[PDB]
Amino acid sequence: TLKYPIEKGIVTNWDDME
Amino acid sequence: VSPKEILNLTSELLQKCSSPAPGPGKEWEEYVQIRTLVEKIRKKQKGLSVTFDGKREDYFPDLMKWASENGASVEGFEMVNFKEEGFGLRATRDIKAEELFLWVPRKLLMTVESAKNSVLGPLYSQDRILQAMGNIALAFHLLCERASPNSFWQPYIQTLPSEYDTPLYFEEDEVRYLQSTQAIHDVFSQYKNTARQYAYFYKVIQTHPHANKLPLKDSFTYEDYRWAVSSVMTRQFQIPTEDGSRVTLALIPLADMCNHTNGLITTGYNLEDDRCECVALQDFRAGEQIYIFYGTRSNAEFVIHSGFFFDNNSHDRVKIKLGVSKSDRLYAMKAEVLARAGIPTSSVFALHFTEPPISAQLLAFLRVFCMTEEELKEHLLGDSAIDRIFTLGNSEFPVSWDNEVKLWTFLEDRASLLLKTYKTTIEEDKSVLKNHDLSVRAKMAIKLRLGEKEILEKAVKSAAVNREYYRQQMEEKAPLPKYE
Ligand SMILES: Nc1ncnc2c1ncn2[C@@H]1O[C@H](CSCC[C@H](N)C(=O)O)[C@@H](O)[C@H]1O
């Protein structure tokens, strides 16, 4: 398969207080 | 109209958005109150600080030349404004599946490392939020280079969209459709975080001398920050660093122009050549749009983070919170059986639309949740106890016919109970989509709240078929399958 598959628009954490 | 008035309103918005959660029953009230302050500030500002005189298609040729000069593929595709998905890539030649048709070298990318070496560097080394939030650091990196006329990424920034369909751009009545759903809480958090982060960094830019050399000190409107974070959350990638130590977030030109379709992940990163690569997910004839597979995200994540609703999403899912109560008579044994199977005592599982509706982890939890005392002892004592735990997530080897009837009965009742928590039904949602003329953003919200109920309703029918099947095996006293 692929060595480093990347995700377009991967969900990240924007809660700066968490 | 006065800089002192903006400093007053941002400080008020900062205190309003820094307060703790007011409780689930008052989140809609706080959301409308935050919108009132944000819209008051936005109507007193001049929109985007940096605008371009030409249309969006006028800057794509400069994007192709700028990318070709750095070793990126610029042949075999063209930019076409599609109605369904927006601007995308269309094949100018036949492209067979598994063919490497797109490569973008590391130099063209906008990463967190390139943000540390830019003009944002001094402020990045002193601000704690930028150091811990790489996505926010990427957003201000995109804003600083946008305000830099001589920026290296100017050919890329001039081709980015000027507006997005994230919930940050929705109107109050469009978000109102999501009431009593699971997704509306994430819409509340997204709006509250964005409003707080803008007010915070607006005060820092105007006061902190480390931000005095930034171009954002001359103009930093809320529209700039809403555009920046929306550009990141809808287009960012997670790539490894140049050495492969840790991972990082990046904006990849050219590659982020392909729209989404169902399939497998074919976009990867080649570390030896230090470039992003994309192979054809399927056969693309000349004149067909070139699609990729973004990821196994749900429609709720596509709407909130990506800014669109994808029909026929094969990975769409809803959340369901289950746990063993301490008041249960068999809590001690059920907690130990789950601990030996690597499953928490209380967690948030998922219900999928495609078969199977429940995963192996949720099936193992529901089985232990309905075990009798004899069945719990067989999973804790004896030489065959480890073998029984090993097959808890397998649908071929149940604990007993009685255990299956009880777990599918509970799931049918729980999924039907969650359906009764929505303010509208499935038939009412389909009636609105047929007898009302709506905007794209309004259709996204209604189809999102409808998608949650259709996944719940299919779980009710799936549990009823399993309940009646294992009831026949229990009534006929069929032999239990043994894993050998
Ligand atoms: N299948 C799809 N249907 C609708 N919109 C899509 C889509 N796939 C991607 N998009 C849109 O494409 C954006 C991702 S970036 C991809 C390029 C974008 N179309 C552009 O004009 O620049 C998303 O935020 C979403 O708006």
Side-chain angles (χ1 to χ4, degrees), chain B residues 288-304:
Chain B
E288 306 195 281
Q289 178 172 182
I290 301 176
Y291 291 95
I292 69 168
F293 181 74
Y294 288 179
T296 57
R297 300 195 296 268
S298 63
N299 277 330
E301 296 167 336
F302 275 152
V303 167
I304 299 174

Side-chain angles (χ1 to χ4, degrees), chain B residues 13 18 64 134 197 206 220 244 284 299 328 343 365 439:
Chain B
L13 182 67
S18 298
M64 308 297 288
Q197 292 160 3
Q206 301 295 330
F220 176 57
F284 300 113
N299 277 330
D328 189 87
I343 303 180
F365 177 86
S439 63

